[PDB]
Amino acid sequence: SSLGWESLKKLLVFTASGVKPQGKVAAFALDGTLITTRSGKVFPTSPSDWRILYPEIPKKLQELAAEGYKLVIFTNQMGIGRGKLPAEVFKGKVEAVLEKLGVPFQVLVATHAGLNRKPVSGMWDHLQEQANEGIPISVEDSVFVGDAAGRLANWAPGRKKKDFSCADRLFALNVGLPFATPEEFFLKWPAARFELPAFDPRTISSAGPLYLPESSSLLSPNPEVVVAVGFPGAGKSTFIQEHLVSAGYVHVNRDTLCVSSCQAALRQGKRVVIDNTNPDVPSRARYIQCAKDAGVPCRCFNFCATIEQARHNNRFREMTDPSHAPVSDMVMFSYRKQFEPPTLAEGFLEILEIPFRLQHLDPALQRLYRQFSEG
Ligand SMILES: [Mg+2]
């Protein structure tokens, strides 16, 4: 007599019989948190390969339930979106697990990358806004428990490997939920050492100068060549389109083509911006030569975004911009291996630094931007 499964775009929801909406929630990851493999292998041999992680679990869940916490699961299962794990098989496993746990659960399943994939808060928002009958949930009185907690190697005998991910801790961080690992929570073990990602999205503002030094000017009244340098996905093209192309700069993009073109623009009295990655000295030298040959100045706009800032931005645009071209990790690390910072010795008249800043986004999108989006 359960409401049962609901299948949405990039989300599955199960509401067991006996589920009641509540103003506080005790939520859990599934794999590595409530269950683990019965086979003792790192990854399951089959849908049947599971057991309850610790015998202490059902008792704790009963206690929570009697105290009025709505019991919830937030589980990433991208295998489903990748077509590696049938949704209909996974639904059966969840129902079996829920039988064994023996308490009413509401389960949310993130089948794909994006807004619903922990650590992004899409599943919380769905629970609160769509699946709790409109009862506001107090985050401070709630709790999320999960094994992707960013723990270092060896936090326990036989744990010679760090957590595969920090997605569960960061999910709780994004939502504002108190957090605990399965061992801390069910076993009362002392807190384990953990790391957070070096780039913290909450510390990214729209303040500060557009470029440095501020005494410089973005535009030149005369012909010139501007060489843009920085990670793909960092927002260079957007910056270039907005500030130079809109001012009549000619947009060169070597991929779609390079020198003769740059030269042709200069003879016409035009100014040119080379909107590419241009990670190293040989890459850039083509354009400096062109400028030198034409006798026009060559400047570099050096975009400060780190690799993690660029990857964060890429993920954000993947979630919010229908026209965004996804930058692959292959391209990111390839750029990083090639990268040599620009210097004046290369033949640049000057180098402007373009600090990485928050774009001009609506309130909701700014809130999304400050969320960690990868474990
Ligand atoms: Mg897990």
Swiss-Prot record:
It catalyses: a 3'end (2'-deoxyribonucleotide 3'-phosphate)-DNA + H2O = a 3'-end 2'-deoxyribonucleotide-DNA + phosphate; a 5'-end dephospho-2'-deoxyribonucleoside-DNA + ATP = a 5'-end 5'-phospho-2'-deoxyribonucleoside-DNA + ADP + H(+). The gene is Pnkp. Keywords: Acetylation, ATP-binding, DNA damage, DNA repair, Hydrolase, Kinase, Multifunctional enzyme, Nucleotide-binding, Nucleus, Phosphoprotein, Transferase. ATP binds at residues 230-237. In the N-terminal section; belongs to the DNA 3' phosphatase family. Monomer. Interacts (via FHA domain) with XRCC4; mainly interacts with XRCC4 phosphorylated by CK2 but is also able to interact at much lower level with unphosphorylated PNKP. GO terms for cellular component: nucleus; SCF ubiquitin ligase complex; site of double-strand break. One of its GO terms (molecular function) is ATP binding. Its EC number is 3.1.3.32, 2.7.1.78. Residues 4-195 are annotated as: Phosphatase. Residues 199-370 are annotated as: Kinase. GO terms for biological process: DNA damage response; double-strand break repair via nonhomologous end joining; protein K63-linked ubiquitination. Plays a key role in the repair of DNA damage, functioning as part of both the non-homologous end-joining (NHEJ) and base excision repair (BER) pathways. Through its two catalytic activities, PNK ensures that DNA termini are compatible with extension and ligation by either removing 3'-phosphates from, or by phosphorylating 5'-hydroxyl groups on, the ribose sugar of the DNA backbone. It comes from the Eukaryota. This is Bifunctional polynucleotide phosphatase/kinase. The chain holds residues 142 to 522 of 522 of the full protein. The FHA domain binds threonine-phosphorylated peptides from XRCC1/4, and is responsible for the recruitment of PNKP to the sites of DNA repair. The affinity is ten times greater if peptides are also phosphorylated on the serine preceeding the phosphothreonine. It is found in: Nucleus. The keyword Membrane does not apply. It comes from Mus musculus.
